[PDB]
Amino acid sequence: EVKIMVEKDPVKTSFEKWAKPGHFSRTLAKGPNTTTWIWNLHADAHDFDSHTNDLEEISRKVFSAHFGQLAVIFIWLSGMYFHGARFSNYEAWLSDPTHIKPSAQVVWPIVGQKILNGDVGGGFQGIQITSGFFQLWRASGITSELQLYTTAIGGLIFAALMLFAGWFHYHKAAPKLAWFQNVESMLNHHLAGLLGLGSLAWAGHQVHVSLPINRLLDAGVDPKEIPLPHEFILNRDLLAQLYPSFSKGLTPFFTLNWSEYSDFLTFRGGLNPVTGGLWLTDTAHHHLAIAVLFLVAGHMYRTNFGIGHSMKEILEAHKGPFTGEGHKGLYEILTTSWHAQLAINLAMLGSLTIIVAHHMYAMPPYPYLATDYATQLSLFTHHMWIGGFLVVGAAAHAAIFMVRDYDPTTQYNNLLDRVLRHRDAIISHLNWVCIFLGFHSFGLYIHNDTMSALGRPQDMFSDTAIQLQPVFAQWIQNTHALAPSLTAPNATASTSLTWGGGDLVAVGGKVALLPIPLGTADFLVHHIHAFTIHVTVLILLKGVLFARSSRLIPDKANLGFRFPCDGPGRGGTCQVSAWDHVFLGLFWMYNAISVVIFHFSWKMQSDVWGSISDQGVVTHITGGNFAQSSITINGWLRDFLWAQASQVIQSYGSSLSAYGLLFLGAHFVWAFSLMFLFSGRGYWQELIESIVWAHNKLKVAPAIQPRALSIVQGRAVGVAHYLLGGIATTWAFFLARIISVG
Amino acid sequence: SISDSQIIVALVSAFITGILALRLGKSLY
Amino acid sequence: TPPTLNADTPAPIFGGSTGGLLRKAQVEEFYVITWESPKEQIFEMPTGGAAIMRSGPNLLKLARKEQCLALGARLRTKFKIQYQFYRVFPNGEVQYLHPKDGVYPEKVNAGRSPVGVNNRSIGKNANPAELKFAHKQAYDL
Amino acid sequence: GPKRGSIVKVLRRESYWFNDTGKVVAVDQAPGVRYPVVVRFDKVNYAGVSTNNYSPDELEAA
Amino acid sequence: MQDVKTYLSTAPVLATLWFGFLAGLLIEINRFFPDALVLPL
Amino acid sequence: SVYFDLGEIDNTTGNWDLYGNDDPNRYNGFQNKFFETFAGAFTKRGLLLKFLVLGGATTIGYLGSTSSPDLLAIKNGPKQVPVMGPRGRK
Amino acid sequence: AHSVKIYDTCIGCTQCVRACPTDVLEMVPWDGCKASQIASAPRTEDCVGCKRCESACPTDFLSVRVYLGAETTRSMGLAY
Amino acid sequence: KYQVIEPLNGDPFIGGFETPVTSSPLIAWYLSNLPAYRTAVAPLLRGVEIGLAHGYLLVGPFVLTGPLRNSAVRGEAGSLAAAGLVTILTMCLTIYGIASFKEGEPSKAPSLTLTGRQKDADKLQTAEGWASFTGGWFFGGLSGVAWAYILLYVLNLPY
Amino acid sequence: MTASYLPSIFVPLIGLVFPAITMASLFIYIEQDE
Ligand code: CLA
Ligand code: CLA
Ligand code: CLA
Ligand code: CLA
């Protein structure tokens, strides 16, 4: 049944298809009559399922493209490591991580840009990075530039390797469709092999090299006197000097008496009191448990060895009264369509990125991470944006599947059919709840603004006037604050310091974390978050459901997934496809994520961070003005935008000048997007004729006739420039603020 | 209009002008 | 040709939907489409979802005309099935529309009159500045 | 009308190829055809087509 | 080898080669003749 | 088994009344008589719209004019000294 | 209620009537182009303004022209 | 209990479903026994009942959260605001009745039951029917606001 | 201000009553088929 399947040498490697630019699609392989050929070439350059029709070639192309992407990622990683090795103040940072700003990039002195190499400390001059790579290397046990150089080379090797594979499995030994379809063995190997063995190997590295080196770094010894990471491998006695449990050998693990490993396999909440990060003796135990979890979970599905589940008997068995014929006919969907898999994978990966961004700020896993505010803010914002993009991509690919892979002749299996058969109800109720949330979230802010404007603050929705204390979040905080005493007797402390329990921790001045309060100003913004998320789901789900047909256009699936409009008739049918719904949902995703990152920035600078002095007095950065000034839009205008934007604007003539330049650059790009977002193709196509006339008058008429951008490319360009401008503006503002004041 | 009757004069004159505008609008329609 | 007459043929099997008729169908026109099939297949409904048509005669009532034409084109192209559809008023006055003379509007046919045909090239119409204070537009001439 | 393979320049005021040249393909010699001349151009229009038919009195420059 | 030359004769490759050569030229000139505001000729 | 007909056209267009209580009387006859003799003259819509507009006009008039000093803030006027002009104005 | 027009340049491609999703355009005998065919719009009372007709005629400029006029229920494409 | 979802009246070609929410014995009974759906009763009585209920419920969100919710005139201002809202709604109902109903049309209401019984349409969808409904609603709303104020800010039994 | 009781008479009669009656009149004129 399950076996290796390969077709020897299916495509001769050559340069013939390389000289003919358009070769994948026959419609544009002929040549560029007009200039709307250069555009759609790059447009459908990666539309593998559009060039051909057989799943086999599509799957082979997908495989090789994955290999190329992995090679590019490996080149990126090797470059980051080589820069940390050659142009970084890492060794100087290790001797004083609380007074040396990280930096791993230097600039050539050519045109006066030399001043971008600011004084970061340690006798170095370069741009201050915020990737958090220094903390990651300190937590990994890396303690010398040499140990970076090597791994850089290592990465490069893998890069080449990946490229080789990418060529091989398309040109010498490419599989056939029947091989990719074995999803049972694929999941078996990704659970047991990739995640399980990977976690086990990292737990091994931790428990062997990362624990003793980091412990000796916490004891205050010089990073040069620390023995090399192999002196703890060929000397169990030198390692047992810190964790004497190693003196007991590998015997406790095999006699099930491994409760004596409590030295390096701990269960302790809170953060390390000197590094402001998690206990590596805890993360080692965590990885050791996760590894065996994924390993025993990688034996569920059936292969050619008789035992195991089959993910078709599992599906059909779930078929209730309310839901027609259950999950029947879904195993046929997710093994004969690459899009219905990409949708689920993108949705789950985006949600997981959001979970990661929420967890890492609250439980700092790297030493001296919660101290460096710039890194902790960038790692939140970047990951939030990535997740917000991935979820919209999931929506788009679900729409694509519904448009050109769905068919009813087999989808009489009343689960997808049933949800398709009450879309007019799903979207109606989602619309109503969106309206309700929008009103009961934004009208409260408008109320507060009008009251504070009418000289009557006593009628506001503040924490002094009518209160809206979120009781459920407070109860959850109080419940997790008491867990290490009742509902977690073995855990020494709560999982995080953000819960109301616990106390403050300092890393030499600046504060790392403390219990976070929750008042009305948090109630309002959480409801605003819910409202924006709901509107985004509304747009995307409406597009996905009405991707096939609607009352307006009953044969929309014949038109396709991507098309501008079905005429100016029926009153007007502009922006009626699913691609246009993704276009419209990108802006609301941008809105939502921008509000989230503003929330996080202000709340952290106001109620979390700061610099404590002796006797315990702690003064936050802004001064705790979030609970009172964030209830009115004017407060977000002056106390957040106007006030905090005072660092970037006056950064000229300093090491933070590039942020001040990119502020205005991103403003220009954002405003430039409006030219494409507001205008239309006809005006520009007409205007181009009056320029072609002047060209013909002087015999400079090009042979590739200059047509204007299509109605869909205009929208694509507009949304791309809009997102670039907005995100780059927020990037520059956030960095120029937090680098100087954090 | 620091006086009192002058406000009443203004009001009644505005009312006459309103009736005139009403007749004009009716004629325009 | 004598237009075909409606009957009480059965309807395709369908579990329901929220994209069916509305109040427009009881205070104004509504449409109904019929066809003949040799077996029992699964066809996609122009209102969302799938339905199994029955052998022999079938009759389906919809809410617009474009829905009927879409479904009929899909039939004629994928299943090779010929069809007709009517329009029914509130007072039960059936009107026969699509195969008005039996032959579909693509193939030529005798006994057909030309409507809206102008005996000139499109770029010859007079300007809209001579026919002012005269409701002839530019092209009805 | 004109000869085959002859290069003629258009005069149709509402033509994409107005004041442009093209070589005749084959003029139909039926009795009642209103636009018999068929000319193909080396540059497509906004719709993408390059062949079009005109009447003999609507295009001639040689 | 002929198709390699044809590929190197493409628009993006010639564009990037030309713009990179021009960037190198201008960068060298500015590294040797910096802060040029008025032509001393 | 058939879902179309020209005779019973209302069966094949969805004109049913899904919730119809045909009960001709639900309340006490005395209470109904005492409710229709008092809320009966209010039936004349021509003589009710012109009644409502005048009632509301006179109501917001009397309440707008015969207000209280403590209730309203625009009626209590200023009870302090005015701030001065930033350029020495008043 | 929109006004469709068919000028005397139709070469009888029959694509206009194939594309119109309302059964508005139909073929008609008319000698003069090649095959004695021409288009005809008798049912203009059903055109919504789809302009699928104009997007199909491979004539110099066009031979079938739709002019958007008074709006009704049929032309608005409403189903409610 | 086998399959609880059904098309409307067993007809698949109508826009809806007979889910447990719309069609159900308890739900159909509760919805039929509401004054707006009781067909044969005179419109004036239904209007009176509905106005009573609405005017009685409306005094709450006006007295507890107003601009004078912290004064000795606490309840009176809210009751006056409720009366203003009910007279405004009466005016809207009146103009709706004028614009939507003619004095010659028999009835726009449905005539059949769920099983096609030839019953009689609701007299509420007549012009005079809607006029009586509006008058009864005006009276009921005023009386309900007055009774709510009487029970709250004249007598005992706080809440 | 001489009167000082007129602003309490007019803006309630021009921001509340005037729109309330003109919108009703215009709605009756719009939604009628004559
Ligand atoms: C050893 C050299 C070599 C040669 C001569 C060929 C030759 C060929 N390959 Mg092939 N291939 C190779 C290596 C090679 N390949 C490797 C290493 C991989 C793994 C990634 C692939 C994967 C691959 C696939 C999946 C496909 C081909 C196809 C083809 C054929 C057409 C290619 C074409 O015209 O597109 C030329 C394309 C380019 C020049 C684009 C190169 C862009 C690279 C791959 C990515 C660079 C990204 C870079 C980081 C830039 C990022 C953005 C930047 C601007 C910042 C042709 C026979 C296609 C085919 O036969 O289908 C009919 C096809 O579908 N190849
Ligand atoms: C796992 C990730 C993933 C994968 C594999 C794909 C794969 C695909 N997508 Mg997809 N997509 C994704 C994520 C992904 N997408 C996400 C996250 C979104 C939400 C934004 C979308 C939204 C989307 C749409 C709306 C469409 C696709 C389409 C496609 C298909 C053709 C893509 C193509 O030819 O692009 C070619 C690539 C380009 C033309 C590059 C464009 C340049 C980008 C827009 C700008 C990049 C900016 C850069 C970061 C910095 C700018 C500055 C610098 C340039 C100077 C292909 C199957 C298309 C389709 O028809 O599917 C069949 C289509 O219409 N996708
Ligand atoms: C600031 C600009 C702005 C505003 C206010 C809105 C508002 C709205 N958009 Mg939106 N939109 C915008 C820009 C904006 N959009 C842009 C730029 C785009 C392009 C990407 C979109 C794309 C877009 C899509 C694709 C969708 C929306 C939707 C919505 C609605 C969501 C429902 C809701 O929350 O109602 C709450 C409404 C408000 C908070 C508005 C303020 C109301 C005030 C507070 C009340 C005033 C009191 C009283 C009525 C005033 C009387 C005045 C009188 C006395 C004279 C809402 C009406 C969605 C929708 O239709 O869902 C229903 C939807 O699907 N929009
Ligand atoms: C166009 C001219 C104009 C404008 C904009 C205003 C504006 C205002 N007047 Mg006013 N007023 C005007 C002329 C005007 N007045 C004249 C000519 C008189 C003498 C009769 C008065 C006598 C007057 C009094 C006695 C009072 C006001 C008050 C007010 C304020 C509240 C509104 C109100 O109650 O109006 C009420 C308006 C009237 C009773 C008479 C209207 C005057 C003319 C006939 C209206 C002009 C018609 C206009 C051009 C058409 C508009 C068309 C438009 C809808 C498209 C407001 C600032 C009140 C105030 O001070 O509050 C603080 C107040 O008590 N006005």
Residue numbers in the entry:
A (entry chain A): 9 to 750
B (entry chain M): 3 to 31
C (entry chain D): 77 to 217
D (entry chain E): 72 to 133
E (entry chain J): 1 to 41
F (entry chain H): 51 to 140
G (entry chain C): 2 to 81
H (entry chain L): 63 to 221
Sentences from the paper on this structure:
In contrast, PSI cores from eukaryotic algae and higher plants exist as a monomer, which is associated with various membrane-spanning light-harvesting complex I (LHCI), forming PSI–LHCI supercomplexes.
The overall structure of the Pp PSI–LHCI is similar to that of land plants reported previously, with a core complex composed of ten transmembrane subunits (PsaA, PsaB, PsaF, PsaG, PsaH, PsaI, PsaJ, PsaK, PsaL, and PsaM) and three extrinsic subunits (PsaC, PsaD, and PsaE) on the stromal side, and peripheral LHCI composed of four Lhca subunits surrounding the core at the PsaG–PsaF–PsaJ–PsaK side. The structure reveals the association of four Lhcas to the PSI core, which is similar to that in higher plant PSI–LHCI, but with Lhca5 replacing Lhca4, and sheds light on the mechanisms of light-energy harvesting and transfer in the PSI–LHCI from bryophytes. In addition to the protein subunits, we found 156 Chl molecules (144 Chls a; 12 Chls b), 34 carotenoid (Car) molecules (26 β-carotenes (BCRs); 4 violaxanthins, 4 luteins (LUTs)), and 10 lipids (6 phosphatidyl-glycerol, 1 digalactosyl diacylglycerol, and 3 monogalactosyl-diglyceride), in the Pp PSI–LHCI supercomplex. A Chl molecule (Chl a305) was found to bind to PsaF in the gap region between PsaF, Lhca5, and Lhca2 in the Pp PSI core. This Chl was not found in any other PSI structures reported so far. By contrast, in P. patens, Chl 305/PsaF provides a bridge to connect Chls of both Lhca5 and Lhca2 with the core complex, facilitating EET from Lhca5 and Lhca2 to the core directly. Without the two connecting pigments, the interaction between Lhca1 and Lhca5 in P. paten is much weakened, and the EET pathways within the Pp PSI–LHCI supercomplex can be changed significantly when compared with the land plant P. sativum. Superposition of Pp PSI–LHCI and Ps PSI–LHCI based on PsaA and PsaB, the two biggest subunits of the PSI core complex, shows a shift in their LHCI belts, with Pp LHCI moving away from the core.
